Nucleic acid binder design. Structure first.
Ligand SMILES: [Mg+2]
Ligand SMILES: [Mg+2]
Ligand SMILES: [Zn+2]
Lengths: 196, 52, 190, 141
RNA sequence: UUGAUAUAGACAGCAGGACGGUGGCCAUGGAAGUCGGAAUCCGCUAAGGAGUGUGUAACAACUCACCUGCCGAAUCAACUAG
């Protein structure tokens, strides 16, 4: 089965690259699978996302592309988690729609944060039974109109720090988006052209 | 009233440990065979029971 | 099965030079001087280069039981060299449920006493290893900071604190109070 | 937000039951339906299906629209009384039809083997047809 | 001894994904992948079992099997009898 799986992967990239000459290298970041099925659903009529093992695609392009060189510009390039999107349309329009379609993923417990978000002052309106978590985080709250209200603004999370379990849950309960990212494109391959 | 991260820190040394099913030794959570001689280094291992 | 030779080397930084007296390795790092012998292990210690200060350890017909000591010697030296150019620091949080754990540092961090453990009237005096001094952290509320050069002395001193504050005749799954290391870091963060 | 949101679904359908329904247990979540809310939610969602019939209930400040999320299972068991080839095809076309599909050949076999416990046309089980999917491979577009 | 994996990059660590119908059907009082009975499909695939465990009344939140990233050379399993 494994021998079958690899070989049909080889002919899969070979025939499609011979069918699709222009490509992106897409950073396969911490991207949930629910978004990946969605990102192609938004892309179903236009393109397809495709990736794999970093050497899986590599030996595919050295082992079967001596017939047509000039695709070897990527041989340095494929490092880390990467991805190949394959449209036959223009570059910038297909560039931004992948960038624009970003899903506000939650803050997984144990993941570094690149963004700094601080809550503003407001009455969240949830039930007045989760007040114990706020005491753990240090903020003092009181019951106004039978709901949880935060008195003052305190710092929530800075960039490049480890998140906490109770904070991770409380951020989700407030329904306030944390630092979030989706598929990010590094640079572009357009028939032997290199562009960021 | 302990902050949960401190509780987990304590749980690392007191709760999160392996117990040998023959000699009741205290082993690190990744143990596969008991380190003691008096049971013959069995692989019969059970986790320490939690207070949940 | 007797192997022909098993060997592995380490790379010594410039700031510390290493002197070899038989099977005794002496380091001359900036933070001080630490000496340790290895006469209980039959090996070959040799300094390699006068330009990059490499030290090599051989085994020469060791069985798999004594094949393991080769890396152990190097690891000891690696911790040994790191301890004299960087130092050691094992931050020690103090967790307590109801009775606040009261610790006061005695002379030069050479003696420490834990006073209010679980509300006992007993006073727990514990002496850490010479060359290891403790210190109350100032960044946050209750955590002891102890420094030193040798990992064994600092660790064993740290373990002394951890074992001294223990609960007797009660569930240790509850009553989680005590003093335990939080992280085994270093000094100068270099 | 829409002047009311009691979106929370319910996994009861078919026969009324009234008391056997779990509306009192979930009622204090939005405070709108109560006992009568079950009565008005059930009357419209009594049949099709006459089964468990998990339903999506969007509130109407006291009333609801009992849109049944079209799972494969809820309709195939209900329509079973045997071929149902066009019947499953038309049941397939009425759904949300997302299924992370790429083509129609994808979605036909999705609803096909979904009733491995619910059989298929005449004297055959929903898997051998899935192998040689040729009849109607492009019929819906 | 037999078998298995491996530069088409093993293994172990460190880090990601771990899905749509579908909170699949019969169970129901709640079981939503995981108290019980049957099934095993689809697409996307990088993989995701209409589910290996923790667990929630349930949710959920984790872990797993399965793939991917870093790491670049051998590694793993089941037996056997001294
Ligand atoms: Mg080590
Ligand atoms: Mg007792
Ligand atoms: Zn034992």
């Amino acid at each position: 089965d494994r021998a079958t799986w690899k070989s049909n992967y080889f002919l899969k990239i070979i025939q499609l690259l011979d069918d699709y000459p222009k490509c992106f290298i897409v950073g396969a970041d911490n991207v949930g699978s629910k978004q990946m099925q969605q990102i192609r659903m938004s892309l179903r009529g236009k393109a397809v996302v495709l990736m794999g093992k970093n050497t899986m695609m590599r030996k595919a392009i050295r082992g079967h592309l001596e017939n047509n060189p000039a695709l070897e510009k990527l041989l340095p390039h494929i490092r880390g988690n990467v991805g190949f999107v394959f449209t036959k349309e223009d570059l910038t329009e297909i560039r931004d729609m992948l960038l624009a379609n970003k899903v506000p993923a939650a803050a997984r417990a144990g993941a570094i944060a690149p963004c700094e978000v601080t809550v503003p002052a407001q009455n969240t309106g949830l039930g007045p039974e989760k007040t114990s978590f706020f005491q753990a985080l240090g903020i003092t709250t009181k019951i106004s109109r039978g709901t949880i209200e935060i008195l003052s603004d305190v710092q929530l999370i800075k960039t490049g720090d480890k998140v906490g379990a109770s904070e991770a849950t409380l951020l989700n309960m407030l329904n306030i988006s944390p630092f979030s990212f989706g598929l990010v494109i590094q640079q572009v391959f357009d028939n032997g052209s290199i562009y960021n | 009233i302990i902050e949960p991260s401190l509780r987990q820190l304590a749980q690392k040394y007191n709760c999160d440990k392996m117990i040998c099913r023959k000699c009741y030794a205290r082993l690190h959570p990744r143990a596969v065979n008991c380190r003691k001689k008096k049971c013959g280094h069995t692989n019969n291992l059970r986790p320490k029971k939690k207070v949940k | 099965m007797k192997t022909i030779l098993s060997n592995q080397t380490v790379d010594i930084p410039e700031n510390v030079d290493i002197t070899l007296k038989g099977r005794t390795v002496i380091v001359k790092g900036p933070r001080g001087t630490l000496r340790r012998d290895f006469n209980h292990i039959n090996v070959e210690l040799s300094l390699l280069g006068k330009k990059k200060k490499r030290l090599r350890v051989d085994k020469w017909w060791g069985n798999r039981k004594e094949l393991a000591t080769v890396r152990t010697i190097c690891s000891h030296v690696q911790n040994m060299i790191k301890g004299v150019t960087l130092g050691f620091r094992y931050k020690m949080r103090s967790v307590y449920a109801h009775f606040p754990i009261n610790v006061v540092i005695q002379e030069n961090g050479s003696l420490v006493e834990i006073r209010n453990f679980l509300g006992e009237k007993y006073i727990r005096r514990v002496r850490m290893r010479p060359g290891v001094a403790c210190s109350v952290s100032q960044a946050q509320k209750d955590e002891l900071i102890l420094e030193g050069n040798d990992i064994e002395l600092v660790s064993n001193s740290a373990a002394l604190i951890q074992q001294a504050t223990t609960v007797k005749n009660k569930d240790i799954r509850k009553f989680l109070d005590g003093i335990y290391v939080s992280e085994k870091g270093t000094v100068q963060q270099a | 937000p829409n002047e009311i949101k009691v979106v929370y679904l319910r996994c009861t359908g078919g026969e009324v039951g009234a008391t056997s329904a779990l509306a009192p247990k979930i009622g204090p979540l939005g405070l709108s339906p109560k006992k009568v809310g079950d009565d008005i939610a059930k009357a419209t969602g009594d049949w099709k299906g006459l089964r468990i019939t998990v339903k999506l209930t969007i509130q109407n400040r006291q009333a609801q629209i009992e849109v049944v999320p079209s799972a494969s299972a809820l309709i195939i068991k209900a329509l079973k009384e045997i071929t149902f080839d066009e019947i499953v095809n038309i049941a397939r076309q009425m759904r949300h039809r997302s299924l992370a599909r790429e083509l129609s050949g994808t979605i036909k076999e999705i609803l096909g083997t979904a009733q491995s416990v619910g059989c298929n046309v005449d004297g055959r089980h929903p898997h051998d047809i899935i192998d040689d999917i040729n009849s109607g491979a492009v019929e819906c577009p």
